PDB file of all heavy atoms in Angstrom:
ATOM      1  N   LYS A   1       6.134 -15.616   6.891  1.00 10.28           N
ATOM      2  CA  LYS A   1       7.483 -15.817   6.491  1.00 10.28           C
ATOM      3  C   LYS A   1       8.113 -14.558   5.841  1.00 10.28           C
ATOM      4  O   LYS A   1       9.315 -14.386   5.867  1.00 10.28           O
ATOM      5  CB  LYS A   1       7.603 -16.973   5.511  1.00 10.28           C
ATOM      6  CG  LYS A   1       7.543 -18.356   6.229  1.00 10.28           C
ATOM      7  CD  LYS A   1       7.573 -19.516   5.203  1.00 10.28           C
ATOM      8  CE  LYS A   1       7.718 -20.829   5.927  1.00 10.28           C
ATOM      9  NZ  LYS A   1       6.511 -21.219   6.749  1.00 10.28           N
ATOM     10  N   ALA A   2       7.294 -13.675   5.256  1.00  9.59           N
ATOM     11  CA  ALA A   2       7.885 -12.534   4.657  1.00  9.59           C
ATOM     12  C   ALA A   2       8.427 -11.614   5.775  1.00  9.59           C
ATOM     13  O   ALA A   2       9.459 -10.942   5.646  1.00  9.59           O
ATOM     14  CB  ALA A   2       6.877 -11.782   3.790  1.00  9.59           C
ATOM     15  N   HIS A   3       7.665 -11.560   6.856  1.00  8.71           N
ATOM     16  CA  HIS A   3       8.019 -10.763   8.064  1.00  8.71           C
ATOM     17  C   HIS A   3       9.249 -11.355   8.771  1.00  8.71           C
ATOM     18  O   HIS A   3      10.125 -10.636   9.194  1.00  8.71           O
ATOM     19  CB  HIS A   3       6.882 -10.699   9.037  1.00  8.71           C
ATOM     20  CG  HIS A   3       5.787  -9.748   8.661  1.00  8.71           C
ATOM     21  ND1 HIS A   3       6.050  -8.385   8.480  1.00  8.71           N
ATOM     22  CD2 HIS A   3       4.499  -9.927   8.441  1.00  8.71           C
ATOM     23  CE1 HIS A   3       4.929  -7.775   8.138  1.00  8.71           C
ATOM     24  NE2 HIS A   3       3.963  -8.715   8.112  1.00  8.71           N
ATOM     25  N   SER A   4       9.348 -12.696   8.826  1.00 10.64           N
ATOM     26  CA  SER A   4      10.509 -13.322   9.460  1.00 10.64           C
ATOM     27  C   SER A   4      11.698 -12.960   8.578  1.00 10.64           C
ATOM     28  O   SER A   4      12.670 -12.468   9.089  1.00 10.64           O
ATOM     29  CB  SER A   4      10.403 -14.851   9.452  1.00 10.64           C
ATOM     30  OG  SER A   4       9.326 -15.273  10.283  1.00 10.64           O
ATOM     31  N   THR A   5      11.544 -13.209   7.306  1.00 11.14           N
ATOM     32  CA  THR A   5      12.650 -12.984   6.363  1.00 11.14           C
ATOM     33  C   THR A   5      13.145 -11.527   6.356  1.00 11.14           C
ATOM     34  O   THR A   5      14.295 -11.293   6.197  1.00 11.14           O
ATOM     35  CB  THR A   5      12.177 -13.331   4.956  1.00 11.14           C
ATOM     36  OG1 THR A   5      11.770 -14.687   4.910  1.00 11.14           O
ATOM     37  CG2 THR A   5      13.324 -13.105   3.965  1.00 11.14           C
ATOM     38  N   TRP A   6      12.214 -10.580   6.480  1.00  9.68           N
ATOM     39  CA  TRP A   6      12.605  -9.206   6.464  1.00  9.68           C
ATOM     40  C   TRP A   6      13.402  -8.834   7.698  1.00  9.68           C
ATOM     41  O   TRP A   6      14.321  -8.051   7.662  1.00  9.68           O
ATOM     42  CB  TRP A   6      11.275  -8.390   6.368  1.00  9.68           C
ATOM     43  CG  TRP A   6      11.367  -6.938   6.325  1.00  9.68           C
ATOM     44  CD1 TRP A   6      11.194  -6.067   7.346  1.00  9.68           C
ATOM     45  CD2 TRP A   6      11.616  -6.111   5.170  1.00  9.68           C
ATOM     46  NE1 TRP A   6      11.313  -4.755   6.945  1.00  9.68           N
ATOM     47  CE2 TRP A   6      11.593  -4.748   5.595  1.00  9.68           C
ATOM     48  CE3 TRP A   6      11.870  -6.382   3.832  1.00  9.68           C
ATOM     49  CZ2 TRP A   6      11.822  -3.708   4.675  1.00  9.68           C
ATOM     50  CZ3 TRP A   6      12.119  -5.317   2.970  1.00  9.68           C
ATOM     51  CH2 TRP A   6      12.065  -3.972   3.411  1.00  9.68           C
ATOM     52  N   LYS A   7      13.079  -9.476   8.851  1.00  8.67           N
ATOM     53  CA  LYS A   7      13.881  -9.184  10.057  1.00  8.67           C
ATOM     54  C   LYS A   7      15.267  -9.665   9.821  1.00  8.67           C
ATOM     55  O   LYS A   7      16.276  -9.011  10.245  1.00  8.67           O
ATOM     56  CB  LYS A   7      13.240  -9.839  11.280  1.00  8.67           C
ATOM     57  CG  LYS A   7      11.757  -9.502  11.504  1.00  8.67           C
ATOM     58  CD  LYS A   7      11.175 -10.186  12.768  1.00  8.67           C
ATOM     59  CE  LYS A   7       9.635 -10.134  12.817  1.00  8.67           C
ATOM     60  NZ  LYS A   7       9.017  -8.811  12.789  1.00  8.67           N
ATOM     61  N   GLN A   8      15.430 -10.878   9.240  1.00  5.40           N
ATOM     62  CA  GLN A   8      16.709 -11.449   9.047  1.00  5.40           C
ATOM     63  C   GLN A   8      17.580 -10.670   8.110  1.00  5.40           C
ATOM     64  O   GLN A   8      18.794 -10.834   8.097  1.00  5.40           O
ATOM     65  CB  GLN A   8      16.587 -12.901   8.541  1.00  5.40           C
ATOM     66  CG  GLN A   8      15.769 -13.794   9.464  1.00  5.40           C
ATOM     67  CD  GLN A   8      15.836 -15.226   9.022  1.00  5.40           C
ATOM     68  OE1 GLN A   8      15.545 -15.595   7.856  1.00  5.40           O
ATOM     69  NE2 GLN A   8      16.192 -16.127   9.972  1.00  5.40           N
ATOM     70  N   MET A   9      16.967  -9.782   7.313  1.00  5.87           N
ATOM     71  CA  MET A   9      17.719  -8.970   6.350  1.00  5.87           C
ATOM     72  C   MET A   9      18.350  -7.734   7.085  1.00  5.87           C
ATOM     73  O   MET A   9      19.181  -7.054   6.578  1.00  5.87           O
ATOM     74  CB  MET A   9      16.892  -8.509   5.219  1.00  5.87           C
ATOM     75  CG  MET A   9      16.685  -9.571   4.144  1.00  5.87           C
ATOM     76  SD  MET A   9      15.311  -9.130   3.019  1.00  5.87           S
ATOM     77  CE  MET A   9      16.023  -7.758   2.055  1.00  5.87           C
ATOM     78  N   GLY A  10      17.844  -7.533   8.271  1.00  6.18           N
ATOM     79  CA  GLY A  10      18.327  -6.370   9.068  1.00  6.18           C
ATOM     80  C   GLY A  10      17.654  -5.004   8.748  1.00  6.18           C
ATOM     81  O   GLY A  10      18.139  -3.974   9.207  1.00  6.18           O
ATOM     82  N   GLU A  11      16.579  -5.053   7.999  1.00  7.98           N
ATOM     83  CA  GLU A  11      15.836  -3.822   7.656  1.00  7.98           C
ATOM     84  C   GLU A  11      15.381  -2.981   8.818  1.00  7.98           C
ATOM     85  O   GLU A  11      14.854  -3.544   9.828  1.00  7.98           O
ATOM     86  CB  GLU A  11      14.648  -4.159   6.809  1.00  7.98           C
ATOM     87  CG  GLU A  11      14.947  -4.720   5.466  1.00  7.98           C
ATOM     88  CD  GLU A  11      15.964  -3.842   4.756  1.00  7.98           C
ATOM     89  OE1 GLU A  11      15.800  -2.567   4.898  1.00  7.98           O
ATOM     90  OE2 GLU A  11      16.861  -4.336   4.106  1.00  7.98           O
ATOM     91  N   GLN A  12      15.506  -1.664   8.788  1.00  8.88           N
ATOM     92  CA  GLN A  12      15.017  -0.807   9.870  1.00  8.88           C
ATOM     93  C   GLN A  12      13.555  -0.450   9.661  1.00  8.88           C
ATOM     94  O   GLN A  12      12.705  -0.676  10.546  1.00  8.88           O
ATOM     95  CB  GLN A  12      15.830   0.480  10.058  1.00  8.88           C
ATOM     96  CG  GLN A  12      15.484   1.262  11.338  1.00  8.88           C
ATOM     97  CD  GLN A  12      14.377   2.337  11.214  1.00  8.88           C
ATOM     98  OE1 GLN A  12      14.718   3.573  10.952  1.00  8.88           O
ATOM     99  NE2 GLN A  12      13.128   1.941  11.330  1.00  8.88           N
ATOM    100  N   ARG A  13      13.259   0.138   8.501  1.00 11.07           N
ATOM    101  CA  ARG A  13      11.853   0.523   8.154  1.00 11.07           C
ATOM    102  C   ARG A  13      10.988  -0.744   8.049  1.00 11.07           C
ATOM    103  O   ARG A  13      11.284  -1.598   7.206  1.00 11.07           O
ATOM    104  CB  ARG A  13      11.863   1.313   6.824  1.00 11.07           C
ATOM    105  CG  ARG A  13      10.489   1.981   6.461  1.00 11.07           C
ATOM    106  CD  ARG A  13      10.402   3.450   6.887  1.00 11.07           C
ATOM    107  NE  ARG A  13       9.117   4.057   6.541  1.00 11.07           N
ATOM    108  CZ  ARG A  13       7.990   3.830   7.159  1.00 11.07           C
ATOM    109  NH1 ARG A  13       7.977   2.926   8.191  1.00 11.07           N
ATOM    110  NH2 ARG A  13       6.840   4.421   6.811  1.00 11.07           N
ATOM    111  N   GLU A  14       9.985  -0.782   8.894  1.00 10.57           N
ATOM    112  CA  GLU A  14       9.066  -1.927   8.927  1.00 10.57           C
ATOM    113  C   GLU A  14       8.456  -2.297   7.597  1.00 10.57           C
ATOM    114  O   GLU A  14       8.380  -1.515   6.640  1.00 10.57           O
ATOM    115  CB  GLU A  14       7.905  -1.645   9.872  1.00 10.57           C
ATOM    116  CG  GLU A  14       8.288  -1.352  11.354  1.00 10.57           C
ATOM    117  CD  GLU A  14       8.825   0.062  11.575  1.00 10.57           C
ATOM    118  OE1 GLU A  14       7.951   1.022  11.445  1.00 10.57           O
ATOM    119  OE2 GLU A  14       9.998   0.284  11.852  1.00 10.57           O
ATOM    120  N   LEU A  15       8.031  -3.563   7.508  1.00  9.24           N
ATOM    121  CA  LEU A  15       7.371  -4.084   6.335  1.00  9.24           C
ATOM    122  C   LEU A  15       5.879  -3.698   6.514  1.00  9.24           C
ATOM    123  O   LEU A  15       5.197  -4.163   7.433  1.00  9.24           O
ATOM    124  CB  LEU A  15       7.459  -5.621   6.356  1.00  9.24           C
ATOM    125  CG  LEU A  15       7.700  -6.389   5.064  1.00  9.24           C
ATOM    126  CD1 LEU A  15       6.933  -7.694   5.174  1.00  9.24           C
ATOM    127  CD2 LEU A  15       7.173  -5.572   3.868  1.00  9.24           C
ATOM    128  N   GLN A  16       5.389  -2.869   5.570  1.00  6.90           N
ATOM    129  CA  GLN A  16       3.980  -2.468   5.673  1.00  6.90           C
ATOM    130  C   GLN A  16       3.142  -3.642   5.137  1.00  6.90           C
ATOM    131  O   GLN A  16       3.633  -4.602   4.570  1.00  6.90           O
ATOM    132  CB  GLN A  16       3.708  -1.184   4.769  1.00  6.90           C
ATOM    133  CG  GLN A  16       4.692  -0.068   4.951  1.00  6.90           C
ATOM    134  CD  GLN A  16       4.724   0.530   6.355  1.00  6.90           C
ATOM    135  OE1 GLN A  16       5.744   0.708   6.975  1.00  6.90           O
ATOM    136  NE2 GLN A  16       3.538   0.775   6.887  1.00  6.90           N
ATOM    137  N   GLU A  17       1.826  -3.538   5.329  1.00  7.15           N
ATOM    138  CA  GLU A  17       0.959  -4.624   4.962  1.00  7.15           C
ATOM    139  C   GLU A  17      -0.420  -4.062   4.831  1.00  7.15           C
ATOM    140  O   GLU A  17      -0.875  -3.363   5.737  1.00  7.15           O
ATOM    141  CB  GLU A  17       1.023  -5.703   6.027  1.00  7.15           C
ATOM    142  CG  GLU A  17       0.125  -6.860   5.836  1.00  7.15           C
ATOM    143  CD  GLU A  17       0.501  -8.084   6.660  1.00  7.15           C
ATOM    144  OE1 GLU A  17       1.142  -7.893   7.753  1.00  7.15           O
ATOM    145  OE2 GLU A  17       0.191  -9.230   6.261  1.00  7.15           O
ATOM    146  N   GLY A  18      -1.167  -4.397   3.755  1.00  6.43           N
ATOM    147  CA  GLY A  18      -2.473  -3.844   3.638  1.00  6.43           C
ATOM    148  C   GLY A  18      -3.216  -4.192   2.362  1.00  6.43           C
ATOM    149  O   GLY A  18      -2.843  -5.186   1.642  1.00  6.43           O
ATOM    150  N   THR A  19      -4.227  -3.404   2.056  1.00  4.33           N
ATOM    151  CA  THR A  19      -5.105  -3.624   0.922  1.00  4.33           C
ATOM    152  C   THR A  19      -4.698  -2.879  -0.382  1.00  4.33           C
ATOM    153  O   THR A  19      -4.463  -1.695  -0.370  1.00  4.33           O
ATOM    154  CB  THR A  19      -6.481  -3.233   1.301  1.00  4.33           C
ATOM    155  OG1 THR A  19      -6.896  -4.069   2.446  1.00  4.33           O
ATOM    156  CG2 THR A  19      -7.487  -3.433   0.140  1.00  4.33           C
ATOM    157  N   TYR A  20      -4.623  -3.645  -1.465  1.00  8.33           N
ATOM    158  CA  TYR A  20      -4.284  -3.027  -2.761  1.00  8.33           C
ATOM    159  C   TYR A  20      -5.637  -2.898  -3.482  1.00  8.33           C
ATOM    160  O   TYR A  20      -6.448  -3.836  -3.453  1.00  8.33           O
ATOM    161  CB  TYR A  20      -3.424  -3.970  -3.538  1.00  8.33           C
ATOM    162  CG  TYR A  20      -3.106  -3.554  -4.960  1.00  8.33           C
ATOM    163  CD1 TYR A  20      -1.988  -2.763  -5.233  1.00  8.33           C
ATOM    164  CD2 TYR A  20      -3.839  -4.027  -5.987  1.00  8.33           C
ATOM    165  CE1 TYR A  20      -1.674  -2.439  -6.555  1.00  8.33           C
ATOM    166  CE2 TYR A  20      -3.534  -3.709  -7.349  1.00  8.33           C
ATOM    167  CZ  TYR A  20      -2.444  -2.911  -7.589  1.00  8.33           C
ATOM    168  OH  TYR A  20      -2.080  -2.664  -8.902  1.00  8.33           O
ATOM    169  N   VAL A  21      -5.949  -1.768  -4.047  1.00  7.72           N
ATOM    170  CA  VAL A  21      -7.172  -1.643  -4.796  1.00  7.72           C
ATOM    171  C   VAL A  21      -6.755  -1.439  -6.246  1.00  7.72           C
ATOM    172  O   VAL A  21      -5.821  -0.699  -6.543  1.00  7.72           O
ATOM    173  CB  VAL A  21      -8.027  -0.376  -4.319  1.00  7.72           C
ATOM    174  CG1 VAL A  21      -7.155   0.927  -4.342  1.00  7.72           C
ATOM    175  CG2 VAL A  21      -9.201  -0.256  -5.220  1.00  7.72           C
ATOM    176  N   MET A  22      -7.392  -2.207  -7.143  1.00  5.14           N
ATOM    177  CA  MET A  22      -7.056  -1.988  -8.532  1.00  5.14           C
ATOM    178  C   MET A  22      -8.155  -1.194  -9.236  1.00  5.14           C
ATOM    179  O   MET A  22      -9.313  -1.405  -8.988  1.00  5.14           O
ATOM    180  CB  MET A  22      -6.889  -3.298  -9.294  1.00  5.14           C
ATOM    181  CG  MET A  22      -6.506  -3.031 -10.757  1.00  5.14           C
ATOM    182  SD  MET A  22      -7.505  -3.930 -11.960  1.00  5.14           S
ATOM    183  CE  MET A  22      -6.781  -3.601 -13.642  1.00  5.14           C
ATOM    184  N   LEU A  23      -7.729  -0.305 -10.101  1.00  6.12           N
ATOM    185  CA  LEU A  23      -8.700   0.376 -10.925  1.00  6.12           C
ATOM    186  C   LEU A  23      -8.082   0.346 -12.344  1.00  6.12           C
ATOM    187  O   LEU A  23      -6.934   0.003 -12.518  1.00  6.12           O
ATOM    188  CB  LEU A  23      -8.995   1.808 -10.457  1.00  6.12           C
ATOM    189  CG  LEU A  23      -7.956   2.657  -9.785  1.00  6.12           C
ATOM    190  CD1 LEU A  23      -6.830   2.904 -10.806  1.00  6.12           C
ATOM    191  CD2 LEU A  23      -8.585   3.989  -9.284  1.00  6.12           C
ATOM    192  N   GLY A  24      -8.888   0.716 -13.327  1.00  6.91           N
ATOM    193  CA  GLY A  24      -8.442   0.567 -14.692  1.00  6.91           C
ATOM    194  C   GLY A  24      -7.355   1.453 -15.252  1.00  6.91           C
ATOM    195  O   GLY A  24      -6.461   0.938 -15.965  1.00  6.91           O
ATOM    196  N   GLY A  25      -7.394   2.763 -15.009  1.00  8.82           N
ATOM    197  CA  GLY A  25      -6.349   3.599 -15.575  1.00  8.82           C
ATOM    198  C   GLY A  25      -6.640   3.896 -17.065  1.00  8.82           C
ATOM    199  O   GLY A  25      -7.722   3.498 -17.589  1.00  8.82           O
ATOM    200  N   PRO A  26      -5.700   4.405 -17.832  1.00  7.88           N
ATOM    201  CA  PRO A  26      -4.279   4.760 -17.520  1.00  7.88           C
ATOM    202  C   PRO A  26      -3.993   6.087 -16.790  1.00  7.88           C
ATOM    203  O   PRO A  26      -2.875   6.310 -16.297  1.00  7.88           O
ATOM    204  CB  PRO A  26      -3.621   4.764 -18.895  1.00  7.88           C
ATOM    205  CG  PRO A  26      -4.725   5.408 -19.795  1.00  7.88           C
ATOM    206  CD  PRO A  26      -6.023   4.737 -19.226  1.00  7.88           C
ATOM    207  N   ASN A  27      -4.966   6.935 -16.652  1.00 12.61           N
ATOM    208  CA  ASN A  27      -4.745   8.183 -15.930  1.00 12.61           C
ATOM    209  C   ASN A  27      -4.625   8.020 -14.433  1.00 12.61           C
ATOM    210  O   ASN A  27      -5.286   7.114 -13.822  1.00 12.61           O
ATOM    211  CB  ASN A  27      -5.895   9.157 -16.211  1.00 12.61           C
ATOM    212  CG  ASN A  27      -7.196   8.746 -15.525  1.00 12.61           C
ATOM    213  OD1 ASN A  27      -7.428   9.111 -14.384  1.00 12.61           O
ATOM    214  ND2 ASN A  27      -8.003   7.996 -16.243  1.00 12.61           N
ATOM    215  N   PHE A  28      -3.899   8.902 -13.728  1.00 14.69           N
ATOM    216  CA  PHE A  28      -3.763   8.852 -12.272  1.00 14.69           C
ATOM    217  C   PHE A  28      -4.962   9.540 -11.696  1.00 14.69           C
ATOM    218  O   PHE A  28      -5.618  10.314 -12.350  1.00 14.69           O
ATOM    219  CB  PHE A  28      -2.469   9.508 -11.851  1.00 14.69           C
ATOM    220  CG  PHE A  28      -1.235   8.629 -11.852  1.00 14.69           C
ATOM    221  CD1 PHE A  28      -1.156   7.592 -12.844  1.00 14.69           C
ATOM    222  CD2 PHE A  28      -0.209   8.762 -10.958  1.00 14.69           C
ATOM    223  CE1 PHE A  28      -0.062   6.736 -12.907  1.00 14.69           C
ATOM    224  CE2 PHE A  28       0.911   7.884 -10.994  1.00 14.69           C
ATOM    225  CZ  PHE A  28       0.988   6.867 -11.959  1.00 14.69           C
ATOM    226  N   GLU A  29      -5.246   9.227 -10.403  1.00 16.44           N
ATOM    227  CA  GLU A  29      -6.451   9.715  -9.780  1.00 16.44           C
ATOM    228  C   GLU A  29      -6.609  11.196  -9.459  1.00 16.44           C
ATOM    229  O   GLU A  29      -5.638  11.912  -9.250  1.00 16.44           O
ATOM    230  CB  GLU A  29      -6.716   8.964  -8.485  1.00 16.44           C
ATOM    231  CG  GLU A  29      -6.829   7.401  -8.612  1.00 16.44           C
ATOM    232  CD  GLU A  29      -5.575   6.719  -9.142  1.00 16.44           C
ATOM    233  OE1 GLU A  29      -4.449   7.058  -8.720  1.00 16.44           O
ATOM    234  OE2 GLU A  29      -5.677   5.823  -9.960  1.00 16.44           O
ATOM    235  N   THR A  30      -7.874  11.639  -9.387  1.00 17.17           N
ATOM    236  CA  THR A  30      -8.182  12.962  -9.006  1.00 17.17           C
ATOM    237  C   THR A  30      -8.152  12.929  -7.464  1.00 17.17           C
ATOM    238  O   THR A  30      -8.177  11.826  -6.850  1.00 17.17           O
ATOM    239  CB  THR A  30      -9.607  13.408  -9.388  1.00 17.17           C
ATOM    240  OG1 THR A  30     -10.540  12.474  -8.764  1.00 17.17           O
ATOM    241  CG2 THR A  30      -9.813  13.409 -10.897  1.00 17.17           C
ATOM    242  N   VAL A  31      -8.132  14.118  -6.840  1.00 14.75           N
ATOM    243  CA  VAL A  31      -8.097  14.187  -5.414  1.00 14.75           C
ATOM    244  C   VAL A  31      -9.335  13.509  -4.816  1.00 14.75           C
ATOM    245  O   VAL A  31      -9.232  12.781  -3.844  1.00 14.75           O
ATOM    246  CB  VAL A  31      -8.002  15.633  -4.882  1.00 14.75           C
ATOM    247  CG1 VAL A  31      -8.250  15.718  -3.385  1.00 14.75           C
ATOM    248  CG2 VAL A  31      -6.584  16.172  -5.171  1.00 14.75           C
ATOM    249  N   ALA A  32     -10.474  13.798  -5.369  1.00 15.52           N
ATOM    250  CA  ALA A  32     -11.692  13.283  -4.797  1.00 15.52           C
ATOM    251  C   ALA A  32     -11.647  11.710  -4.974  1.00 15.52           C
ATOM    252  O   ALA A  32     -12.225  10.986  -4.155  1.00 15.52           O
ATOM    253  CB  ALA A  32     -12.923  13.845  -5.523  1.00 15.52           C
ATOM    254  N   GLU A  33     -11.008  11.242  -6.007  1.00 15.79           N
ATOM    255  CA  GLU A  33     -10.916   9.842  -6.175  1.00 15.79           C
ATOM    256  C   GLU A  33      -9.978   9.240  -5.167  1.00 15.79           C
ATOM    257  O   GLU A  33     -10.236   8.186  -4.572  1.00 15.79           O
ATOM    258  CB  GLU A  33     -10.503   9.431  -7.610  1.00 15.79           C
ATOM    259  CG  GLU A  33     -11.675   9.618  -8.680  1.00 15.79           C
ATOM    260  CD  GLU A  33     -11.189   9.643 -10.075  1.00 15.79           C
ATOM    261  OE1 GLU A  33      -9.895   9.585 -10.275  1.00 15.79           O
ATOM    262  OE2 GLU A  33     -11.943   9.734 -11.026  1.00 15.79           O
ATOM    263  N   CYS A  34      -8.869   9.913  -4.887  1.00 18.52           N
ATOM    264  CA  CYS A  34      -7.940   9.405  -3.883  1.00 18.52           C
ATOM    265  C   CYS A  34      -8.564   9.389  -2.483  1.00 18.52           C
ATOM    266  O   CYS A  34      -8.312   8.420  -1.754  1.00 18.52           O
ATOM    267  CB  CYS A  34      -6.653  10.201  -3.828  1.00 18.52           C
ATOM    268  SG  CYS A  34      -5.709  10.060  -5.270  1.00 18.52           S
ATOM    269  N   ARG A  35      -9.370  10.335  -2.126  1.00 18.47           N
ATOM    270  CA  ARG A  35      -9.943  10.309  -0.806  1.00 18.47           C
ATOM    271  C   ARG A  35     -10.916   9.190  -0.711  1.00 18.47           C
ATOM    272  O   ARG A  35     -10.910   8.416   0.260  1.00 18.47           O
ATOM    273  CB  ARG A  35     -10.643  11.580  -0.422  1.00 18.47           C
ATOM    274  CG  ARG A  35      -9.702  12.782  -0.484  1.00 18.47           C
ATOM    275  CD  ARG A  35     -10.487  14.129  -0.336  1.00 18.47           C
ATOM    276  NE  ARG A  35      -9.582  15.242  -0.158  1.00 18.47           N
ATOM    277  CZ  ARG A  35      -9.946  16.467   0.141  1.00 18.47           C
ATOM    278  NH1 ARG A  35     -11.233  16.767   0.374  1.00 18.47           N
ATOM    279  NH2 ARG A  35      -9.005  17.435   0.304  1.00 18.47           N
ATOM    280  N   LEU A  36     -11.713   9.038  -1.748  1.00 17.59           N
ATOM    281  CA  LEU A  36     -12.746   8.005  -1.856  1.00 17.59           C
ATOM    282  C   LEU A  36     -12.111   6.624  -1.709  1.00 17.59           C
ATOM    283  O   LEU A  36     -12.546   5.801  -0.930  1.00 17.59           O
ATOM    284  CB  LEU A  36     -13.457   8.201  -3.202  1.00 17.59           C
ATOM    285  CG  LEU A  36     -14.443   7.213  -3.816  1.00 17.59           C
ATOM    286  CD1 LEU A  36     -14.843   7.752  -5.188  1.00 17.59           C
ATOM    287  CD2 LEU A  36     -13.857   5.796  -3.929  1.00 17.59           C
ATOM    288  N   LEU A  37     -11.031   6.380  -2.418  1.00 15.75           N
ATOM    289  CA  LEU A  37     -10.384   5.084  -2.354  1.00 15.75           C
ATOM    290  C   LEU A  37      -9.818   4.826  -0.934  1.00 15.75           C
ATOM    291  O   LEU A  37      -9.857   3.691  -0.461  1.00 15.75           O
ATOM    292  CB  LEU A  37      -9.250   5.012  -3.416  1.00 15.75           C
ATOM    293  CG  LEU A  37      -9.668   5.038  -4.901  1.00 15.75           C
ATOM    294  CD1 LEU A  37      -8.424   4.942  -5.774  1.00 15.75           C
ATOM    295  CD2 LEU A  37     -10.578   3.845  -5.283  1.00 15.75           C
ATOM    296  N   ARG A  38      -9.279   5.828  -0.300  1.00 14.65           N
ATOM    297  CA  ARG A  38      -8.753   5.663   1.039  1.00 14.65           C
ATOM    298  C   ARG A  38      -9.906   5.238   1.896  1.00 14.65           C
ATOM    299  O   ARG A  38      -9.847   4.374   2.729  1.00 14.65           O
ATOM    300  CB  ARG A  38      -8.157   6.987   1.555  1.00 14.65           C
ATOM    301  CG  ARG A  38      -7.691   6.909   3.008  1.00 14.65           C
ATOM    302  CD  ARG A  38      -6.683   5.790   3.116  1.00 14.65           C
ATOM    303  NE  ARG A  38      -6.241   5.579   4.514  1.00 14.65           N
ATOM    304  CZ  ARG A  38      -5.683   4.501   4.943  1.00 14.65           C
ATOM    305  NH1 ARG A  38      -5.489   3.457   4.039  1.00 14.65           N
ATOM    306  NH2 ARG A  38      -5.305   4.349   6.191  1.00 14.65           N
ATOM    307  N   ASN A  39     -11.069   5.922   1.676  1.00 14.80           N
ATOM    308  CA  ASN A  39     -12.214   5.627   2.502  1.00 14.80           C
ATOM    309  C   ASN A  39     -12.763   4.222   2.240  1.00 14.80           C
ATOM    310  O   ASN A  39     -13.491   3.681   3.075  1.00 14.80           O
ATOM    311  CB  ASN A  39     -13.248   6.717   2.326  1.00 14.80           C
ATOM    312  CG  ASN A  39     -12.868   7.973   3.140  1.00 14.80           C
ATOM    313  OD1 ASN A  39     -11.784   8.562   2.960  1.00 14.80           O
ATOM    314  ND2 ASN A  39     -13.790   8.431   4.013  1.00 14.80           N
ATOM    315  N   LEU A  40     -12.512   3.644   1.076  1.00 11.20           N
ATOM    316  CA  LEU A  40     -12.953   2.287   0.812  1.00 11.20           C
ATOM    317  C   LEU A  40     -12.128   1.250   1.595  1.00 11.20           C
ATOM    318  O   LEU A  40     -12.384   0.003   1.503  1.00 11.20           O
ATOM    319  CB  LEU A  40     -12.791   1.984  -0.684  1.00 11.20           C
ATOM    320  CG  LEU A  40     -13.988   2.054  -1.652  1.00 11.20           C
ATOM    321  CD1 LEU A  40     -15.060   3.015  -1.246  1.00 11.20           C
ATOM    322  CD2 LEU A  40     -13.409   2.423  -2.993  1.00 11.20           C
ATOM    323  N   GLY A  41     -11.063   1.730   2.255  1.00 13.88           N
ATOM    324  CA  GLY A  41     -10.176   0.803   3.013  1.00 13.88           C
ATOM    325  C   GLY A  41      -8.924   0.433   2.264  1.00 13.88           C
ATOM    326  O   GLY A  41      -8.213  -0.414   2.663  1.00 13.88           O
ATOM    327  N   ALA A  42      -8.654   1.127   1.117  1.00 15.44           N
ATOM    328  CA  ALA A  42      -7.476   0.814   0.299  1.00 15.44           C
ATOM    329  C   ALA A  42      -6.251   1.478   0.921  1.00 15.44           C
ATOM    330  O   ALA A  42      -6.322   2.559   1.465  1.00 15.44           O
ATOM    331  CB  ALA A  42      -7.666   1.299  -1.146  1.00 15.44           C
ATOM    332  N   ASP A  43      -5.113   0.791   0.766  1.00 12.28           N
ATOM    333  CA  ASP A  43      -3.850   1.319   1.273  1.00 12.28           C
ATOM    334  C   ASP A  43      -2.910   1.717   0.137  1.00 12.28           C
ATOM    335  O   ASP A  43      -2.105   2.613   0.313  1.00 12.28           O
ATOM    336  CB  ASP A  43      -3.151   0.250   2.151  1.00 12.28           C
ATOM    337  CG  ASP A  43      -3.818   0.088   3.524  1.00 12.28           C
ATOM    338  OD1 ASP A  43      -3.737   1.072   4.329  1.00 12.28           O
ATOM    339  OD2 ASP A  43      -4.366  -1.005   3.789  1.00 12.28           O
ATOM    340  N   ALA A  44      -3.081   1.069  -0.986  1.00  9.57           N
ATOM    341  CA  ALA A  44      -2.300   1.343  -2.149  1.00  9.57           C
ATOM    342  C   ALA A  44      -3.101   1.126  -3.450  1.00  9.57           C
ATOM    343  O   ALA A  44      -4.009   0.256  -3.426  1.00  9.57           O
ATOM    344  CB  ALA A  44      -1.062   0.371  -2.157  1.00  9.57           C
ATOM    345  N   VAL A  45      -2.850   1.886  -4.467  1.00  9.71           N
ATOM    346  CA  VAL A  45      -3.551   1.829  -5.763  1.00  9.71           C
ATOM    347  C   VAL A  45      -2.669   1.520  -6.919  1.00  9.71           C
ATOM    348  O   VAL A  45      -1.584   2.124  -6.994  1.00  9.71           O
ATOM    349  CB  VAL A  45      -4.227   3.171  -6.189  1.00  9.71           C
ATOM    350  CG1 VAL A  45      -5.614   3.210  -5.774  1.00  9.71           C
ATOM    351  CG2 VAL A  45      -3.403   4.363  -5.634  1.00  9.71           C
TER     352      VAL A  45
END
């Protein structure tokens, strides 16, 4: 339904969809951490 709804809004840029990985923070990731997370199959952090 989110995909149906998004089409009805007339949006051009597609609705992405994927895996959210949570980590503790508060600091933002190092480069090696960002590659590692991408490799774990995460799409967003």
